[PDB]
Amino acid sequence: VNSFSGYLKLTDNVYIKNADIVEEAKKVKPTVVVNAANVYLKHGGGVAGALNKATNNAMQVESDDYIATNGPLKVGGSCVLSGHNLAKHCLHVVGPNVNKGEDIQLLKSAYENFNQHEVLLAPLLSAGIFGADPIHSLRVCVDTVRTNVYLAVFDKNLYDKLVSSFL
Numbered sequence: 001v002n003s004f005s006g007y008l009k010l011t012d013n014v015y016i017k018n019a020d021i022v023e024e025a026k027k028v029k030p031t032v033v034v035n036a037a038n039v040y041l042k043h044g045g046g047v048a049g050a051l052n053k054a055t056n057n058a059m060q061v062e063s064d065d066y067i068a069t070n071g072p073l074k075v076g077g078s079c080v081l082s083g084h085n086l087a088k089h090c091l092h093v094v095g096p097n098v099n100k101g102e103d104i105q106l107l108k109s110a111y112e113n114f115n116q117h118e119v120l121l122a123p124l125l126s127a128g129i130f131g132a133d134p135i136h137s138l139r140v141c142v143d144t145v146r147t148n149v150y151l152a153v154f155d156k157n158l159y160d161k162l163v164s165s166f167l
């Protein structure tokens with residue numbers, strides 16, 4: 001039993017809710033919140049901008065030190081950093097950005113990072129301003145992630161579309 005409330009069950013291990021991931025994280029304080037990051041950990045917009053704003057820019061400060069030490073992530077890769085006021089940890093995961101011309105085939109590799117954590121609160125990778133087909137991303141999620149994932153979908157019309165089209 002965990003404290004995630006109001007989620008629709010898609011599969012044995014994947015759940016979904018129309019919710020602001022910042023507000024869900026503040027309420028639940030999950031062990032892991034997933035950020036939809038880029039390789040430079042520049043948290044400008046979308047999920048990343050929203051999470052970073054909620055941390056008062058502390059996520060960005062920490063991220064800049066990470067990059068200065070380690071260099072950029074790979075598309076499809078991840079790193080674990082602090083969750084600040086939102087979660088114990090933030091798993092920064094880089095899905096492909098179609099609006100940068102990046103290979104959507106890397107989406108499965110991106111979701112594989114979730115399997116290193118027993119329970120996660122996450123957005124749909126590569127959706128929104130990353131430009132991928134969200135129905136496809138949800139399919140890749142359910143077919144790749146084996147650990148317990150709680151998906152928070154910000155856009156109400158998107159949530160409705162995803163539920164109504166899910167196989």
Ligand SMILES: CC(C)n1nnnc1SCc1c(C(=O)O)sc2cccc(F)c12
Nearest residue numbers: 036046047050123127128129153154155
């Ligand atoms: C958190 C919330 C307040 N917020 N604010 N600004 N953007 C958002 S989330 C829009 C969105 C998704 C969704 O609608 O769930 S998944 C997804 C994946 C990558 C980038 C995204 F932008 C995005």
